């Protein structure tokens, strides 16, 4: 049946290297290493008995520069013992991972057993063959109008959630997980916290438990107290689990990677620990590739019924799109959901500013077959009129309300009744995409039929 067992029944001795040439920052350098690998995750034993894992990063002749995830602190040349496993970091995966809470490095903190591995998969993964990919054309009804109508999330989409520090991005992401469902017919959530607060992790865990998603969710929690070097591997572990459960098990998976800003801060700390290129704002020049190896593990593949949707939750430092984390994440991912501090202060939930938001995979996955015919034109017209509303609001602020034209007044009314009634939703209110489109048509019927220039004439005649 399965021949992967035969290679498993092999014992490989590991060399214990007491020869530690030196240590600096998070990098511990070994000497007299016999044929070092390039990513051999080692088991570095401290003088006090603590065992920290580390993986080599640069291997000159008879030398290996190990970085330890838990930190060098306490490492001594005379007493530390480093054993080379001989293979890269491999997460023990199985179908029983669903319903278990793991630490940052995959060690189970659910007070339960060690995961009874069905396979050992490298956390770094491999690029999915573009010929083997399938373009995601199956719309997900997230239940929130700002994401279903204005934007649109497919099944294989990797649309993240751009947000600031204090915004309710966590409540939006938990809303999406508790409401995600195919428009025209469950999601095994894989949640990866990186440097989140205890309050955030507790909120996510309690939300999953109360909504019943905990029976099909595998948390990889890396709190702020957890070491800042294993934030690099936590999304890799969670995404390897998601890739398993999706491709090799045929389960649709929501991957929620919280605090990708914290992941990128860990990446910048690791890079600055070395003599890496500073990129922009101190982040490594390889940041794009690293974030690519994170995000691009999503998508569907040919012949396998599983799929992975990645909803990374970013934390923009100054609510700036131009910052490297949001810029690189927008360049890689297939859209973004822009949570706005302006709308949050205005009191709107969800505080989604749809103008910076986008979804590449709306183009296909919305249309006549997936949903009703008018959706694309309605979304385009809504974007145009929302922008006209914001511009007319700025013009009103500058030059008073009297100078505005009839079009500007209509657009201000549309802006008010669009932010107040369309974007705004309850935390537990889910709207069918057709209901959202009907509300959108009410908002467009605010206007006369002539000003809806982005609507095709046939759609406008059939839907006005």
């Amino acid at each position: 049946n399965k021949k992967a067992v035969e290679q498993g029944f092999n014992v490989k001795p590991r060399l214990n290297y007491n020869t530690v040439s030196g240590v600096n920052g998070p990098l511990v350098i070994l000497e007299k290493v016999k044929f070092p690998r390039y990513n051999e995750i080692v088991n570095l034993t401290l003088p006090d008995g603590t065992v920290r894992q580390g993986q080599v990063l640069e291997i000159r002749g008879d030398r290996a520069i190990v970085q330890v995830f838990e930190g060098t602190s306490g490492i001594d040349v005379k007493k530390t013992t480093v054993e080379f496993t001989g293979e890269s970091l491999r997460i023990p995966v199985s179908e029983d991972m669903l319903g278990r809470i793991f630490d940052g490095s995959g060690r189970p903190i659910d007070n339960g057993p060690k995961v009874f591995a069905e396979d050992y998969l490298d956390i770094n993964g491999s690029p999915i063959n573009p010929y083997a990919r399938i373009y995601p054309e199956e719309m997900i009804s997230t239940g929130v109008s700002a994401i279903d109508t204005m934007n649109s999330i497919a099944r294989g989409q990797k649309i993240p959630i751009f947000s600031a520090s204090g915004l309710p991005h966590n409540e939006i992401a938990a809303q999406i997980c508790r409401q995600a469902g195919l428009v025209r017919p469950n999601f095994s959530i894989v949640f990866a916290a990186m440097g989140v607060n205890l309050e955030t992790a507790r909120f996510f865990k309690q939300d999953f438990e109360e909504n019943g998603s905990l029976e099909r969710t595998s948390l990889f929690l890396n709190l702020a107290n957890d070491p800042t070097i294993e934030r690099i591997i936590t999304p890799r572990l969670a995404l390897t689990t998601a890739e398993y459960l999706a491709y090799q098990t045929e389960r649709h998976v929501l991957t929620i990677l919280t605090d990708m800003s914290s992941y990128a801060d860990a990446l910048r700390e690791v890079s600055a620990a070395r003599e890496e290129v500073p990129g922009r704002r101190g982040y490594p020049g390889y940041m794009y590739t690293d974030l690519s190896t994170i995000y691009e593990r999503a998508g569907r593949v040919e012949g396998r019924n599983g799929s992975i949707t990645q909803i990374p939750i970013l934390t923009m430092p100054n609510d700036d799109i131009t910052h490297p984390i949001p810029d690189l994440t927008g360049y890689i991912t297939e859209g973004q959901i822009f949570v706005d501090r302006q709308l949050h202060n205005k009191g709107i939930y969800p505080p989604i500013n749809v103008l910076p938001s986008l979804s590449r995979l709306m183009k296909s996955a919305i249309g006549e077959g997936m949903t009703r015919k008018d959706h694309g034109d309605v979304s385009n017209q809504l974007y145009a009129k929302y922008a006209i509303g914001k511009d007319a609001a700025a013009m009103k602020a500058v030059v008073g309300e009297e100078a505005l034209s009839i079009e500007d007044k209509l657009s201000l009314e549309f802006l008010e009744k669009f932010e107040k009634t369309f974007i705004t939703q309850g935390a537990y209110e889910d709207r069918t995409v057709f209901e959202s489109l009907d509300q959108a048509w009410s908002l467009l019927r605010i206007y006369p039929k002539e000003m809806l220039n982005r609507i095709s004439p046939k759609i406008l005649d059939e839907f006005y």
Partner: protein
């Protein structure tokens, strides 16, 4: 006098609003961007000197 004064007041209030809502925010944004780019140049020089 009433008509001229009302016109001048409307112009002055318009210019106050224009300043506070365009010129001050545009200049503040330009200041922030120039400061960020200067910090970027300083960081690049620091990395080159470190090399």
């Amino acid at each position: 006098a009433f008509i001229i004064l009302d016109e001048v007041i409307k112009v002055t209030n318009r210019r106050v609003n224009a300043i506070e809502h365009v010129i001050i925010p545009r200049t503040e944004n330009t200041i922030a961007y120039i400061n960020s780019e200067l910090d970027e140049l300083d960081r690049e020089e620091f990395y080159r000197l470190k090399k």
